[PDB]
Structures are given as C-alpha cells and as structure tokens.
Design an enzyme around this catalytic site. Structure first.
Site, PDB file in Angstrom:
ATOM      1  N   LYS A   1      50.611  32.476  16.368  1.00  0.00           N
ATOM      2  CA  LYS A   1      49.395  32.983  15.718  1.00  0.00           C
ATOM      3  C   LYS A   1      49.638  33.470  14.289  1.00  0.00           C
ATOM      4  CE  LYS A   1      49.211  37.853  17.110  1.00  0.00           C
ATOM      5  NZ  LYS A   1      48.360  38.846  17.801  1.00  0.00           N
ATOM      6  N   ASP A   2      50.912  33.619  13.912  1.00  0.00           N
ATOM      7  CA  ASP A   2      51.278  34.007  12.549  1.00  0.00           C
ATOM      8  C   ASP A   2      51.408  32.780  11.652  1.00  0.00           C
ATOM      9  OD1 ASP A   2      51.385  36.744  13.104  1.00  0.00           O
ATOM     10  OD2 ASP A   2      53.546  36.748  13.454  1.00  0.00           O
TER      11      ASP A   2
ATOM     12  N   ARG B   1      49.137  51.650  11.356  1.00  0.00           N
ATOM     13  CA  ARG B   1      50.151  50.802  10.743  1.00  0.00           C
ATOM     14  C   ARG B   1      51.530  50.941  11.367  1.00  0.00           C
ATOM     15  NH1 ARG B   1      47.047  51.754   5.886  1.00  0.00           N
ATOM     16  NH2 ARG B   1      48.190  53.746   5.998  1.00  0.00           N
TER      17      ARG B   1
ATOM     18  N   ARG C   1      39.682  41.177  14.672  1.00  0.00           N
ATOM     19  CA  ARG C   1      39.255  40.446  15.868  1.00  0.00           C
ATOM     20  C   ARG C   1      39.123  41.302  17.098  1.00  0.00           C
ATOM     21  NH1 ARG C   1      42.424  39.226  20.211  1.00  0.00           N
ATOM     22  NH2 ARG C   1      44.277  39.657  19.086  1.00  0.00           N
ATOM     23  N   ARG C   2      40.065  42.209  17.222  1.00  0.00           N
ATOM     24  CA  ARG C   2      40.127  43.179  18.271  1.00  0.00           C
ATOM     25  C   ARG C   2      39.086  44.306  18.058  1.00  0.00           C
ATOM     26  NH1 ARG C   2      46.581  43.301  18.366  1.00  0.00           N
ATOM     27  NH2 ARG C   2      46.935  41.889  20.052  1.00  0.00           N
TER      28      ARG C   2
ATOM     29  N   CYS D   1      44.577  34.219  10.557  1.00  0.00           N
ATOM     30  CA  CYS D   1      44.905  35.583  10.954  1.00  0.00           C
ATOM     31  C   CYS D   1      43.818  36.589  10.544  1.00  0.00           C
ATOM     32  CB  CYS D   1      46.271  36.011  10.376  1.00  0.00           C
ATOM     33  SG  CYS D   1      47.628  35.905  11.546  1.00  0.00           S
TER      34      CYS D   1
ATOM     35  N   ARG E   1      54.237  52.040  16.091  1.00  0.00           N
ATOM     36  CA  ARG E   1      52.941  52.300  16.675  1.00  0.00           C
ATOM     37  C   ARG E   1      53.068  53.100  17.974  1.00  0.00           C
ATOM     38  NH1 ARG E   1      48.751  47.282  15.351  1.00  0.00           N
ATOM     39  NH2 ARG E   1      49.404  47.071  13.157  1.00  0.00           N
TER      40      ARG E   1
HETATM   41  C1  LIG Z   1      47.267  36.838  13.240  1.00  0.00           C
HETATM   42  C2  LIG Z   1      47.885  38.130  13.779  1.00  0.00           C
HETATM   43  N1  LIG Z   1      49.291  38.416  13.864  1.00  0.00           N
HETATM   44  C3  LIG Z   1      49.434  39.640  14.384  1.00  0.00           C
HETATM   45  C4  LIG Z   1      50.771  40.402  14.567  1.00  0.00           C
HETATM   46  C5  LIG Z   1      51.651  39.895  15.727  1.00  0.00           C
HETATM   47  N2  LIG Z   1      52.306  38.538  15.743  1.00  0.00           N
HETATM   48  C6  LIG Z   1      52.819  38.316  17.117  1.00  0.00           C
HETATM   49  C7  LIG Z   1      52.686  39.592  17.922  1.00  0.00           C
HETATM   50  C8  LIG Z   1      52.750  39.553  19.450  1.00  0.00           C
HETATM   51  C9  LIG Z   1      52.080  38.388  20.201  1.00  0.00           C
HETATM   52  C10 LIG Z   1      52.565  36.934  20.046  1.00  0.00           C
HETATM   53  O1  LIG Z   1      53.496  36.859  19.556  1.00  0.00           O
HETATM   54  O2  LIG Z   1      51.408  36.124  19.949  1.00  0.00           O
HETATM   55  C11 LIG Z   1      51.591  40.378  17.220  1.00  0.00           C
HETATM   56  C12 LIG Z   1      51.465  41.850  17.593  1.00  0.00           C
HETATM   57  C13 LIG Z   1      50.213  42.197  18.374  1.00  0.00           C
HETATM   58  O3  LIG Z   1      49.361  41.128  18.548  1.00  0.00           O
HETATM   59  O4  LIG Z   1      50.381  42.974  19.531  1.00  0.00           O
HETATM   60  C14 LIG Z   1      48.053  40.197  14.635  1.00  0.00           C
HETATM   61  C15 LIG Z   1      47.627  41.569  15.236  1.00  0.00           C
HETATM   62  C16 LIG Z   1      47.549  42.752  14.278  1.00  0.00           C
HETATM   63  C17 LIG Z   1      47.556  44.197  14.830  1.00  0.00           C
HETATM   64  O5  LIG Z   1      46.521  44.484  15.745  1.00  0.00           O
HETATM   65  O6  LIG Z   1      47.574  45.152  13.790  1.00  0.00           O
HETATM   66  C18 LIG Z   1      47.176  39.250  14.252  1.00  0.00           C
HETATM   67  C19 LIG Z   1      45.661  39.421  14.332  1.00  0.00           C
HETATM   68  C20 LIG Z   1      45.061  39.103  15.689  1.00  0.00           C
HETATM   69  O7  LIG Z   1      45.905  39.341  16.768  1.00  0.00           O
HETATM   70  O8  LIG Z   1      43.799  39.603  15.893  1.00  0.00           O
END
Ligand SMILES: Cc1[nH]c(Cc2[nH]cc(CCC(=O)O)c2CC(=O)O)c(CCC(=O)O)c1CC(=O)O
Length: 318
Positions: free
Chosen positions: A62-63, A131, A113-114, A223, A137
C-alpha cells in the site's frame, strides 16, 4: 545468478518484512547466496536498484503508488496477511470496543481513509491525528491520556509481534482497508529478467489478482485520499467492493462488483515483454485472470465516477 542483494531501510518493520521474504527465497533457492544491504523514501532504494547496488527491495504494497517510475516494477506479490484495520485501546479500556467507548473518546489516526470512515460510523467519538512509528504510537497511547485508542493495520502489529495488543479487528462495514494493505510487494528492475524469474516464485496467485483489482480501481479514480476497498475470491468469483468518502465522512459512495475469474493453479512459461499491469509483473501467472482483475477494478472506478466520485476526491486531498 550468485549473490542476491536485498536492500532494506533501517526501520524495524521494514527489516522484519525484508527478512520474511529473504527467508522464503532461501527456502526455494537453498543453493544461492542472499545478502542484505541496510540503508517517499522509496526513491533512495530505487536509486540503489538503478545503480545495481541491490537487486530487490521489499515494501508494504500500500506504500507503493499505482504508477511506478519507468525502469522499476513489482516483481512479486506475496501471500496476503490479514488486510483489516485494528484498534488498540488505552490501558483503561480493556474489553471495550469502538461501539462501547465513552462519548467524545479520542481515537488516534493520521489516515484520511480511516478517519473519514470512522467518523461516519462513530459520530460520537473524536478522531485526531497522531504521529510516529508503530512503537512511538503505542508509547503515546499507554504513557499519556490524550488517546483512548489508536487505529493501526492488523498486519503490521502481527509482524512486529504485538498482536496481543489488538483489542478490536474492524469489519468492512465499520472500516474498509487501504488498497494493497497486508500484502508485501517486491520491487525490482523492470528489465532484469533473471531477478524477475527468481522472485516470481513468491507470487501468490489469489493475492496477486485481488491486488491487481484493488490497484486498478485506485489508479483509475486518479496513499493520500479517502478511498478504500474489500476483495474476496470465493468459488471462482472475484468480488470487489470500493468506496469513497468526504473528509468528514458525510458524503459517501460505495459499490460492489463481481466477475468470474479462475484462480490459476499452475504456472506457465509466459510472454516476456507483455506490459506490467498496474506496476506489477507476473509473467509466470496466466495473463487472462490478471487482465480480468484489472478490468474489474476499472469497471468499479467508472461506476463510482459516474456517481460523482471525482468531486468528492477533489475536495478530499492531503
Ligand atoms: C498508504 C498508507 N501507508 C500507511 C503506513 C503503513 N504502511 C504499512 C503498514 C502496515 C500494514 C501493511 O503493511 O499493509 C502501515 C501502518 C498502519 O497501516 O497500521 C498508511 C496509514 C497511516 C496511519 O494511519 O497514520 C497509509 C494510509 C491508509 O492506511 O489509510
């Protein structure tokens, strides 16, 4: 093919994810040597790919943007871990749910999104940005009292070994996940065919198709937006649910579509030089279901667009 160089960021989660992939590659390729080079930050890793300093990099899918720079590609989509979002409660709210929290309880999340989806479903709670990495966190949550809870990916907690901190796992109806969430993508040089063949062993057909659908949906919306999905492959059917929300979650469009896509059991010697689909290269998986999956995601995006999705998105950037 002699030493495989895997590049990785120094962060803990990135390091864990990289290790799980290297482990899986060693298991398949016990006779080869793998070496780990520890360095969007994505463009410094890509540079190391560009310079032949490493041969592959592991990301959270997702990144990765739906469009990759020319010269790079996602060579592998690994078996998906749990895609759902999760709630970790303050030390005071054990056994509790979002449903059961006190009115005006503060929930920490920096994700549009959340926040959009959760404000809509829980108008009596307060959502505030927070942050830090996952470790930071969790400390803020337990060590202060700003937050009654925080929202994080089930998958990331799992990989960090913190699954026992999970108080609630959210269902689609409460909160749909980000495109590609829970999946790892391995990025490589688009033209390096040895590496591509090598990592091709990692592809999980089912996860591959789901993620093609999800990313095609995302890309076609055109994202950092309040978009979410849900996918399932069941009985020869791929189901795709997608939604879009305004910043506050008051405006919303969601729809589900479906298509007959067999999940391919066997590999195949496939057409070198077919184009990647939404940044993904899977020459060893049958092309047909991959195209069908991409078409499904395009279909859903168009339906949402005909219902006004674009103006919701123009107002809901970050
Ligand atoms: C595109 C992206 N990348 C990450 C940050 C990141 N990148 C991978 C991990 C874990 C899950 C996996 O790897 O998919 C997560 C951390 C989070 O989602 O708990 C977030 C969450 C940001 C946070 O709420 O401030 C988002 C936005 C989306 O999820 O709505």
């Amino acid at each position: 093919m002699r030493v495989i160089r895997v590049g990785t960021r120094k962060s803990q989660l990135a390091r864990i994810q990289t290790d799980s992939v290297v482990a899986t590659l060693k298991a398949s390729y016990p006779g080869l040597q793998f070496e780990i080079i520890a360095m969007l930050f994505t463009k410094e890793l890509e540079h190391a790919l560009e310079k032949n300093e490493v041969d592959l990099v592991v990301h959270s899918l997702k990144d990765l943007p739906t469009v990759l720079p020319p010269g790079f590609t996602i060579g592998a989509i690994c078996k998906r871990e749990n895609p759902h979002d999760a709630v970790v409660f303050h030390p005071k709210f054990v056994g509790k749910t979002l449903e059961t929290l006190p009115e005006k309880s503060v929930v920490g999340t920096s994700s549009l999104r959340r926040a959009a989806q959760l404000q809509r479903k829980f108008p009596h709670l307060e959502f505030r940005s927070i942050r830090g990495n996952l470790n930071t966190r969790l400390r803020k949550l337990d060590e202060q009292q700003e937050f009654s809870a925080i929202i994080l990916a089930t998958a990331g907690l799992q990989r960090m070994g913190w699954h026992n901190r999970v108080g609630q796992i959210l269902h689609p109806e409460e909160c749909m996940y980000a495109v590609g969430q829970g999946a790892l993508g391995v990025e490589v040089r688009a033209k390096d065919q040895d590496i591509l063949d090598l990592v091709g062993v990692l592809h999980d057909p089912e996860t591959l198709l789901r993620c093609i659908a999800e990313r095609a949906f995302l890309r076609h919306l055109e994202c950092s937006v309040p978009v979410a999905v849900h996918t399932a492959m069941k009985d020869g059917q791929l189901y795709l649910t997608g939604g879009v929300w305004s910043l506050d979650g008051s405006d919303s469009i969601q729809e589900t579509m479906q298509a007959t896509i067999h999940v391919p059991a066997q590999h195949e010697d496939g057409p070198e030089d077919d184009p990647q689909l939404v940044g993904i290269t899977a020459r060893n998986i049958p092309r047909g279901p991959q195209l069908a999956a991409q078409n499904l995601g395009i279909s859903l995006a168009n339906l949402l667009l005909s219902k006004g999705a674009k103006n919701i998105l123009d107002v809901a950037r970050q």
